[PDB]
């Protein structure tokens, strides 16, 4: 609970004002627990952020797992999946923060050690459509990891860079993208 | 030196720490001078980031036109181009500070005949590249706009969302994305 808290409040907190400005002071005292009680739960910022983090890839999971209910084969859930992550992406409140962060830890391994257990998960939603599309017949791919890291990375990339046009025009974009992609694996 | 001087710790700064870790001062501290000297092609912080940009963007134009040349047919001038968008020195190193740079700086009319003249060089190449491919029979590309910026920033997808990684594992991702989006076209 008073874990619970200390993630609740310092959610809203990063949201608010970013990852840089946020102390744990603040969120110490806004959660009403302690630096030791904080310290045991977390021991850094960083660490705390990472954890908020794993908690908000579950809840994409679970939307995506009821979201790709709406597209029935593994090249509708492609479509469907960066359709997806442009347009949540776009009102994210978040999105500022972990922008913050990575710049923050990049030159450390430590706090960009589970920022890889995590991002394997980002990916893993491509690994699974791949992989079916594969038994599904839909496509015959030579190894799902690689597609899927560049899958993965191209959306994040159209997704992030084009920020600076009309989110119409983005979406039109992105699915052109998922079409002429998905027509390099036949 | 005045003008052509400062850009250089701006940049490192720049580079090393975000759009936001580094400040007017800390630049001026380790370049020694007036925090007034931005002024005359240097409005605003986001001016002389701005510039650094331009600056970074035809340096790493400048070299793209004299290695292009170990590329025969458009179709290898597409995959050079994003081979060597992964091992530059130039502009790419930069794509972090500029994404962060996004989250803020983005609401003044600046960021809107500035800013759009950048964003021209950087889907240029890929015009170029689309373009002498349907003059040349390559492919047959619908609307080389819509390809272009979709492949521009894929590519800084791959180079950027991938940053903490063998260096070969990642040559080897991008030639795999080139050959997948080119197949996907013609
Ligand atoms: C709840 C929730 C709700 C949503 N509406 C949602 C929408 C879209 C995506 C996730 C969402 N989730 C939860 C999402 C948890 C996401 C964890 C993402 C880890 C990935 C980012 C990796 N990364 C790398 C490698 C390298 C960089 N230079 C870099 C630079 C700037 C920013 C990121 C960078």
């Known amino acids: 609970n008073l874990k619970d808290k200390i993630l609740g409040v310092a ?18 005292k806004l959660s009403e627990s302690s630096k030791g009680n904080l ?11 990472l954890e908020i983090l794993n908690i908000q890839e579950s809840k994409w999971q679970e939307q995506w797992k009821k979201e790709q209910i709406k597209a029935k084969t593994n090249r509708e859930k492609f479509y469907l999946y960066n359709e997806l992550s442009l347009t949540t ?3 994210y409140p978040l999105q500022n923060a972990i922008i913050e962060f990575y710049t923050e830890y990049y030159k450390t391994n430590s706090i960009n050690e589970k920022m890889n257990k995590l991002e394997n998960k ?3 939603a491509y690994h699974v459509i791949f992989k079916e599309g594969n038994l599904n017949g839909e496509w015959s791919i030579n190894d799902v990891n690689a597609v899927s890291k560049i899958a993965a990375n191209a959306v994040n990339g159209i997704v992030t860079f084009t920020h600076e046009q009309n989110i119409n025009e983005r979406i039109k974009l992105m699915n052109k993208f998922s079409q002429i992609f998905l027509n390099g694996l036949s």
Chains 1, 2 share one sequence.
């Open 122 to 124: 980002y990916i893993d």
């Open 39 to 49: 310290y045991y739960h977390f021991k850094t910022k960083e660490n705390l952020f």
């Open 11 to 28: 959610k809203e907190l990063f949201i608010k004002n970013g990852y840089n400005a946020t102390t744990t002071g603040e969120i110490v």
């Open 89 to 91: 992406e776009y009102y």
